[PDB]
Design a protein around this nucleic acid. Structure first.
Lengths: 204, 99, 203
RNA sequence: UUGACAUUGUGAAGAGACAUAGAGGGUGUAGAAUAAGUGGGAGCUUCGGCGCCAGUGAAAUACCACUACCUUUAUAGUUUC
RNA sequence: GUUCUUUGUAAAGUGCCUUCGAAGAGUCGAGUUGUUUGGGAAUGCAGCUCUAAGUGGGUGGUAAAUUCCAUCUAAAGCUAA
RNA sequence: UUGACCUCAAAUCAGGUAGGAGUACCCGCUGAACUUAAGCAUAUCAAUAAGCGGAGGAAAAGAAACCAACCGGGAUUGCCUUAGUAACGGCGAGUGAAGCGGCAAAAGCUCAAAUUUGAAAUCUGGUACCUUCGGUGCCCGAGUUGUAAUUUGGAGAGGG
């Protein structure tokens, strides 16, 4: 189980030889086809910090600009509409709201090809800002399948504790197992190869 | 399960005090036992598979279980027998090739 | 016991091991006679569940029967009737190969009162079975509160009638609403509802 | 009579998928350059080679999970004719 | 009814607890061929091909997926009226 | 060389048993046509006659891999009811059941599957006598490729 090997727990804290903070991936095995319907395309909601410092571009106005300097990243306003229009893309993702959908008419010319903007297919506009910040920096895992039957994502860090990250890969063993369509194969939880970025892989 | 005490209802019947005695020996005829479990796997390593069971495991490991149930149903009988058959061969693929 | 092992072993005939042993013995019976006496039973596990005791009066027999169907014995194909009634090669039998083989070995050894039998081999041209018969002549079997019923004329040629397992499965002496037409005495029961009975009084 | 399957097996060559680990090459113009190409990346590392805050395009490289498109590229076992 | 041999370091019956606890395979079923039948997506029965399992399998009179309840125990046999 | 084991033999050896008859009533397989449909091809007749094989005094069957959906019944059969109904069917002519209720009659069970293994304790035949449908001494063989004892699901056994 998850209590034995590392997985996202204990064992791999004697295997890392780096000084920096890196995020590990979790490889699963789920047989699917080449069509456009079979797959687990959701957003596995994690509880505690993943410490992945993916600096944002939060632009809020009035009393939403003040509740942006505790758990979130960059604190912006509605005056910063001509700020990132040029060529600067120093943000992994952004986050608008109720007072930024009217100001969502001039932040569309330079975010089309990749699409890191605030649309209506991947949750960006919310009036509850200090609630969805513990879901983007804590990481609510971004998913989108390609062509074959395998899939990787993101959990948390390994320079923390053991029973505090055992609830991070807990609501992931039941998130990529549910959205995983009824057009799949034998076992939706099988081959487990957990490689970080320096050391070996442990299996369950 | 208790009744409605009336003619019909979700419980069509009479409200009578149930006695329920000790059940028969003719209920556990699906019981395996250490006598059978033992010999069953012993003679299975001696007899093994067959030609249809060989390309049956290479059908799963090569394609899938939806396709393997689609073969053994025309190879055998019911979809109920197909479910049971694949459960068996998969404990031999995982517990032999890896363990 | 070897019986528990030999029993489940003869359930996985789809294995390369049994099909080699088979090939050897099937050729063996094929190099013999159509009807001959087998010294020792090949399946004492199946033989013992039928009622087998090793000693005097226990005759084991081997039958080399042909397969296919029953071609009507009409010369040239000569019928005379209706097309629905005019079948020739789509003709079967109301009896199984097993049952029928026992009947031919009984026309041979009539002093014996055959028990039953089981399948042993088969290729395509022939089918093979291992029969068991008992002789109510020996005082060893004549007495004994296990076979007393055999020595009586009520058990003289059970296979000739179908008082045997295979014949009672074919004759359909089973319990059920599916075997209602032939619960016990198909013809007697048939003739039973086909009977117009009236009492001294017409109700 | 003709096809099908049972009967009905042991091999050899020749084409041939597959389970598997290594390897390998593809956007021609720009960016001295090898782009369907995603996420982590300021370092992995006794070097520093590239980097990179920088820059150009339809698309940024060692740190590459291979999650990949792909290989009639070499095989440890089976396979269709 | 009267009478002779002690059946016997024989066996049967019950009460409490523990471990267990084996129940018939070229059979079941299925497809199809034909036949019988009150049997209707196939009533039984025989052929040939395929070819079972054990919290299992048979049946619940409409085939089927799916999650279930009922209900018993085939593939051995014997018995008067 | 001597002695077994396996399998297949020989005799006017020993001791046995089979065929054929009958066939009113019962158990199988094979199997019609006529008739009717105002014709006649499915159908009906009929799962009948004849034919081939097997018994007894009854015979076969039978203690549920049942019938039900009840406050469930509870081996076989027969009769009354069901009901001439459900269903079947050129949906035509026609054919064609069952559980139940009532009642007569009433019977139960045993073999494989298990280490007797501190003991093949089991049984045939010869032969001696006898208390002669049978008992018992002695000798062969059966037979350990499994005979008694025990136990068959309703249980039940190894143990205490």
């Amino acid at each position: 189980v998850k209590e034995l090997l590392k997985y996202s727990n204990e064992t791999k804290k004697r295997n890392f030889l780096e000084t920096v903070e890196l995020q590990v991936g979790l490889k699963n095995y789920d047989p699917q086809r080449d069509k456009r319907f079979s797959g687990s395309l959701k957003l596995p909601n994690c509880p505690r910090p993943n410490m992945s410092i993916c600096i944002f571009g939060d632009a809020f106005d009035v009393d939403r600009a003040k509740s942006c300097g505790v758990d979130a990243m960059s604190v912006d306003d509605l005056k910063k509409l001509n700020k990132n229009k040029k060529l600067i893309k120093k943000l992994s993702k952004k986050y608008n709201a109720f007072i930024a959908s009217e100001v969502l008419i001039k932040q569309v010319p330079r975010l089309l090809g990749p699409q890191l903007s605030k649309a209506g297919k991947f949750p960006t506009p919310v009036s509850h800002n200090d609630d969805l910040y513990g879901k983007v920096t804590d990481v609510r895992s971004t998913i989108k399948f390609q062509l074959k039957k395998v899939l990787c994502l993101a959990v948390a860090v390994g320079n923390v504790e053991m029973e505090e990250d055992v609830l991070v890969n807990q609501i992931l063993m039941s998130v990529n197992f549910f959205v995983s369509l009824l057009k799949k194969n034998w076992q939706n939880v099988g081959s487990l190869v957990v490689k970080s970025s320096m050391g070996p892989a442990f299996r369950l | 399960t208790v009744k409605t005490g009336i003619a019909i209802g979700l419980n069509k019947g009479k409200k009578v005090t149930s006695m329920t005695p000790a059940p028969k020996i003719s209920y556990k005829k699906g019981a395996a036992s250490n006598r059978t479990k033992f010999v069953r796997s012993l003679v299975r390593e001696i007899a093994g598979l067959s030609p249809y069971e060989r390309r049956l495991i290479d059908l799963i490991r090569n394609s899938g279980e939806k396709r393997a149930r689609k073969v053994a149903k025309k190879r055998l009988g019911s979809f109920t027998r197909a479910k049971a058959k694949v459960e068996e061969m998969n404990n031999i693929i995982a517990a032999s090739r890896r363990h | 016991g070897a019986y528990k092992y030999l029993e489940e072993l003869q359930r996985k005939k789809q294995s390369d091991v049994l099909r080699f042993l088979q090939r050897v013995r099937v050729w063996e019976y094929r190099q013999k006679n159509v009807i001959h006496r087998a010294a020792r039973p090949t399946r004492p596990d199946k033989a013992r569940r039928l009622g087998y005791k090793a000693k005097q009066g226990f005759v084991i027999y081997r039958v080399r029967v042909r397969r296919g169907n029953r071609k009507r014995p009409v010369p040239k194909g000569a019928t005379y009737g209706k097309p629905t009634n005019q079948g020739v090669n789509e003709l079967k039998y109301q009896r199984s190969l097993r049952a029928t083989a026992e009947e031919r070995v009984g026309r041979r050894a009539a002093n014996l009162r055959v028990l039953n039998s089981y399948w042993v081999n088969q290729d395509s041209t022939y089918k093979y079975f291992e029969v068991i018969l008992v002789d109510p002549q020996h005082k060893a079997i004549r007495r004994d509160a296990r076979y007393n019923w055999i020595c009586d004329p009520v058990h003289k040629h059970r296979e000739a009638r179908g008082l045997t397992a295979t014949g009672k499965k074919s004759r359909g002496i089973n319990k059920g609403h599916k075997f209602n037409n032939t619960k016990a005495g198909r013809r007697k029961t048939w003739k039973r509802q086909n009977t117009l009975s009236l009492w001294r009084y017409r109700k």
